[PDB]
């Protein structure tokens, strides 16, 4: 499962978490098994405007 | 007191039961001895512990 | 107030809509010990000390 978020919300990608992303965008199961990988993309996804 | 041998028996059983009942009032290391309170105060991740 | 002189405010006789707090994006750390913030909406307390 691939997507993009903001840094402050990276914590929300984890079991038993709350917030905008977990509640409304992407929710992991409480007994989730598997790996989560996240890295900054400022050089790629940001624009001056 | 003549029938003490019988009375003793009764008493012992009662005492046992009483202690059992009072064991419901102990936290055993939990944060509360009432299951309903723990269910109402914590989400599953730590309510399970 | 300064940390050595931390201010204490007493909260009582009021309705506490904790959503305004835990739905706000203005906080970088929000850590509740002994309670889950969602369930605060369903709970009452006798003493609140901010």
Swiss-Prot record, chain A:
What does the UniProt entry list as the effect of changing residue 20 to N?
Answer: In strain: Beta/B.1.351, Omicron/BA.1, Omicron/BA.2, Omicron/BA.2.12.1, Omicron/BA.2.75, Omicron/BA.4, Omicron/BA.5, Omicron/BQ.1.1, Omicron/XBB.1.5, Omicron/EG.5.1; May enhance affinity to human ACE2 receptor
Per the UniProt entry, the effect of residue 11 to S is: In strain: Omicron/BA.2, Omicron/BA.2.12.1, Omicron/BA.2.75, Omicron/BA.4, Omicron/BA.5, Omicron/BQ.1.1, Omicron/XBB.1.5, Omicron/EG.5.1
Q: What is the effect of changing residue 48 to P?
A: In strain: Omicron/XBB.1.5, Omicron/EG.5.1
At the top level, the lineage of the source is Viruses
Q: Where is this region: Integrin-binding motif?
A: 6-8
Q: What is the effect of changing residue 49 to S?
A: In strain: Omicron/BA.1, Omicron/BA.2.75, Omicron/XBB.1.5, Omicron/EG.5.1
Function per UniProt: Attaches the virion to the cell membrane by interacting with host receptor, initiating the infection. The major receptor is host ACE2. When S2/S2' has been cleaved, binding to the receptor triggers direct fusion at the cell membrane. When S2/S2' has not been cleaved, binding to the receptor results in internalization of the virus by endocytosis using host TFRC and GRM2 and leading to fusion of the virion membrane with the host endosomal membrane. Alternatively, may use NRP1/NRP2 and integrin as entry receptors.
Question: Subunit details for this protein?
Answer: Binds to host ACE2. RBD also interacts with the N-linked glycan on 'Asn-90' of ACE2. Cleavage of S generates a polybasic C-terminal sequence on S1 that binds to host Neuropilin-1 (NRP1) and Neuropilin-2 (NRP2) receptors. Interacts with host integrin alpha-5/beta-1 (ITGA5:ITGB1) and with ACE2 in complex with integrin alpha-5/beta-1 (ITGA5:ITGB1). May interact via cytoplasmic c-terminus with M protein. May interact (via N-terminus) with host bilirubin and biliverdin, thereby preventing antibody binding to the SARS-CoV-2 spike NTD via an allosteric mechanism.
The name on file for this protein is Spike protein S1
Q: Which organism is it from?
A: Severe acute respiratory syndrome coronavirus 2 (2019-nCoV)
Q: Indicate the span of the full protein covered.
A: 398 to 446 of 1273
UniProtKB/Swiss-Prot annotation, chain C:
Q: How does it assemble?
A: Binds to host ACE2. RBD also interacts with the N-linked glycan on 'Asn-90' of ACE2. Cleavage of S generates a polybasic C-terminal sequence on S1 that binds to host Neuropilin-1 (NRP1) and Neuropilin-2 (NRP2) receptors. Interacts with host integrin alpha-5/beta-1 (ITGA5:ITGB1) and with ACE2 in complex with integrin alpha-5/beta-1 (ITGA5:ITGB1). May interact via cytoplasmic c-terminus with M protein. May interact (via N-terminus) with host bilirubin and biliverdin, thereby preventing antibody binding to the SARS-CoV-2 spike NTD via an allosteric mechanism.
Per the entry, what this protein does is: Attaches the virion to the cell membrane by interacting with host receptor, initiating the infection. The major receptor is host ACE2. When S2/S2' has been cleaved, binding to the receptor triggers direct fusion at the cell membrane. When S2/S2' has not been cleaved, binding to the receptor results in internalization of the virus by endocytosis using host TFRC and GRM2 and leading to fusion of the virion membrane with the host endosomal membrane. Alternatively, may use NRP1/NRP2 and integrin as entry receptors.
Q: Which consequence is recorded for altering residue 26 to P?
A: In strain: Omicron/BA.1, Omicron/BA.2, Omicron/BA.2.12.1, Omicron/BA.2.75, Omicron/BA.4, Omicron/BA.5, Omicron/BQ.1.1, Omicron/XBB.1.5, Omicron/EG.5.1
Q: Supply the source organism for this entry.
A: Severe acute respiratory syndrome coronavirus 2
**Identification of the protein by name:** Spike protein S1
What are the top taxonomic ranks of the organism?
A: Viruses, Riboviria, Orthornavirae, Pisuviricota, Pisoniviricetes
- Impact reported for residue 24 to F: In strain: Omicron/BA.2, Omicron/BA.2.12.1, Omicron/BA.2.75, Omicron/BA.4, Omicron/BA.5, Omicron/BQ.1.1, Omicron/XBB.1.5, Omicron/EG.5.1
Q: What is the effect of changing residue 21 to I?
A: In strain: Omicron/XBB.1.5, Omicron/EG.5.1
Q: Which domain of life is it from?
A: Viruses
Effect noted on mutating residue 29 to A: In strain: Omicron/BA.2, Omicron/BA.2.12.1, Omicron/BA.4, Omicron/BA.5, Omicron/BQ.1.1, Omicron/XBB.1.5, Omicron/EG.5.1
